[PDB]
Amino acid sequence: GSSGSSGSSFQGPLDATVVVNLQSPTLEEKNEFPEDLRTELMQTLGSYGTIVLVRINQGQMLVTFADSHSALSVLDVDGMKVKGRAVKISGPSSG
């Protein structure tokens, strides 16, 4: 297996930011992320780690955390659904 190697991974932006999007958003969402969802998300996603900053875009949701690993998890568990709505998190990183 790969326990040691895995353990010592160390790889992530000090920023710890990620973009959140909805799979099947409605007019309300298509217009701008809802508050009933935001909080739920901010409080939800936050759980995994710690919300240190957040920025909702006309049609996006750049959430920031304290640690990077957290993002990974949130990126893995992303598959999860909020308010019966499928969420999709991406990596706002590209050089």
Q: Which residues contact 36 (CB under 8 A, 6 or more apart)?
A: 83
Pick from 58, 55, 43, 44: nearest CA to 18: 55
CA distance 42 to 95: 27
- Alpha-carbon torsion angle 45, 7, 16, 70, nearest 10: 0
CATH code: domain 1-95 is 3.30.70.330
User: In Å, how far from its chain's centre is CA 1?
Assistant: 29
CB-CB neighbours of 61 under 10 Å: 21
Pick from 32, 12, 18, 29: nearest CA to 63: 18
CA distance 66 to 23: 26
Method of determination used here: NMR
